[PDB]
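Ticket opened by: R.M.
Priority: normal
Category: complex prediction / small molecule

The reporter submitted a protein together with fe (iii) ion and asked that the result be attached to this ticket for the collaborator who will pick it up next week. Submitted input follows.
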Amino acid sequence: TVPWFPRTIQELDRFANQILSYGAELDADHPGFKDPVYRARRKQFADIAYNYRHGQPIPRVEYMEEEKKTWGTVFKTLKSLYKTHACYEYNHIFPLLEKYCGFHEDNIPQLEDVSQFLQTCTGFRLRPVAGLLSSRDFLGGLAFRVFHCTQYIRHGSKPMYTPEPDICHELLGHVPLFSDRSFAQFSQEIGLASLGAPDEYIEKLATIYWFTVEFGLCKQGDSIKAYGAGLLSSFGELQYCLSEKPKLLPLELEKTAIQNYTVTEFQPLYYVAESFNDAKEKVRNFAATIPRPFSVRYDPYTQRIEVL
Ligand SMILES: NC[C@@H](O)c1ccc(O)c(O)c1
Ligand SMILES: [Fe+3]
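Result attached by the on-call engineer:
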């Protein structure tokens, strides 16, 4: 019977008791696996997320010198690419993040400050997330313009590599696009489409998410640039996605929704969105095909979903 979904923004608190308990940092393969200090630091951030409740300021954390060093390395190496490789919406907001959110090589921005900045731009807000949420819960938060965001940093031994999202990927990859109004409306439509959808459609929407929010390319006049968070936070793949090597296809959701992808190599193919307004309209149409015995609307005045 129709799977449960949150109907008020506060009900997202129910997700904390629904994450994968045995994290990536526990795999022998993890860059930080043999490091007990790293292991304890990850538990520390996991506890902060576990105890967080909607409405509370997100706890500030004093990052260690080793952690600020890893951030500085990632920030400085990626920043050189944005002006030529990132979509216009990214470069438009980046200077404002540098000025009001402290995006600078010597300092890791605190999530509370970034979340307040996002709220002023598009009403998106962040909440710290312990480990891996199911695709259903993760996509469901988007319906309320809530992005579940990691607060820990990748291990310092391999600054240019992370097998999982970390704070560098959230802040340099995702945050700038959530400041844009059309991208915000587009991400929210994916979220609304997921509410109470059957498991096999959640997987189709998670694939659409992967090919837009994480690895999407934008058409910008006669040029093509990157807006996917996974590209904007990957030095190597960001340069590769705008070269002659990968295959480019127009975003077509009935097609994108079932395309396979790997998470370990550079993507062999990417979908190009005409604009975020257009992608939003395509998602809205795709959502009408999802069998759900009802319709949903978000009411921003009360932060509640209305089930028709
Ligand atoms: N859903 C798979 C999980 O590894 C994931 C979800 C959303 C993201 O933005 C991401 O970077 C990773
Ligand atoms: Fe991501």
